[PDB]
Amino acid sequence: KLSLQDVAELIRARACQRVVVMVGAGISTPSGIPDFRSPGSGLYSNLQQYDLPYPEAIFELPFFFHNPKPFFTLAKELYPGNYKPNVTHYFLRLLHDKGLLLRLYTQNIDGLERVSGIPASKLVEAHGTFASATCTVCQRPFPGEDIRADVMADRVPRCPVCTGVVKPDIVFFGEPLPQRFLLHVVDFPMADLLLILGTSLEVEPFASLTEAVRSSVPRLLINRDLVGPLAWHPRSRDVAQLGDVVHGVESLVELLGWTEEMRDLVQRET
Ligand SMILES: CCCCCCCCCCCCC/C(=N/CCCC[C@H](NC(=O)OCc1ccccc1)C(=O)NCC[N+](CC)(CC)CC)O[C@@H]1[C@H](O)[C@@H](COP(=O)(O)OP(=O)(O)OC[C@H]2O[C@@H](n3cnc4c(N)ncnc43)[C@H](O)[C@@H]2O)O[C@@H]1S
Ligand SMILES: [Zn+2]
């Protein structure tokens, strides 16, 4: 039914003023960060040199309590690298600057949405952040940088007060989501457009948010594959721009005529 041009004209005519966006690791592979479940290139295919029964265990809370050393060993791999936002992040920052963004729900823990200049009030970091850390024992909070040096020196970071293992405030498997996740009860009923970018929609409860929009709300998926409830519970106003998220976002900015605004933003940020 609807197409990528139809969605662009709804934004141009301001028929969609309250856009909600859900993103996953696919939007950060163009920034050099590997995703999780892409075959071959994903993290779950490149954990051979780790003491793991199965790859998902490294992000599971029970295994973390049993042995946190494999997690902090992997953390030392993407901690030192400096990563920059790409065209998808700046498209979402421009969506915000034009007053069209209701809320950006991200599963990513790379912090690139904040780097792109989207205020924290517009973000729901549903799987946490490395910007802060907490002792798993005494609950004391610490800035994320306080454990950086320990992770680099092949050490599991420990609480300076009680010696408990200190965890960055990311959400492992089996760990509750942060409080700000509950904002979906007010955001999704009011959304008039839903964008889903670069996620496999395999992790709950974040995945089920695609179903929380009203049935008349168009859902635009820019992803390599048709995934999640968009594949088994499709709706009349669903648009799928299948392929690279870079190419799909680039096509959308062109149809929106935001090319000149995008250049100004990129030149000011970078
Ligand atoms: C420098 C930083 C950069 C990053 C690297 C740093 C290294 C450290 C890693 C740490 C990360 C945190 C781990 C995490 N941890 C999520 C845990 C979930 C928590 C949830 N809490 C919960 O319920 O408490 C309830 C509770 C209530 C009361 C008390 C206590 C608890 C939970 O436990 N639920 C399960 C529920 N159970 C089973 C149902 C289990 C308990 C209940 C029985 O998060 C992640 C992640 O965020 C999550 C979602 O993944 P994604 O979708 O973002 O990415 P991926 O899969 O790779 O796909 C990507 C798609 O894009 C496509 N693509 C790709 N490239 C392109 C391209 N160029 N162009 C186009 N397309 C492209 C590709 O083709 C795919 O299509 O998966 C994993 S684990
Ligand atoms: Zn402690």
Residue numbers in the entry: 122 to 391
What does the paper say about this structure?
Sirtuins constitute a conserved family of nicotinamide adenine dinucleotide (NAD+)-dependent lysine deacylases with seven members known as SIRT1–7 in mammals. SIRT3, a member of the sirtuin family of NAD+-dependent protein deacylase, is critical for DLBCL growth and survival. SIRT3 deacetylates a broad variety of mitochondrial proteins involved in cellular metabolism. Among sirtuins, SIRT1, 2, and 3 share similar enzymatic activities, which is challenging for the design of SIRT3 specific inhibitors.
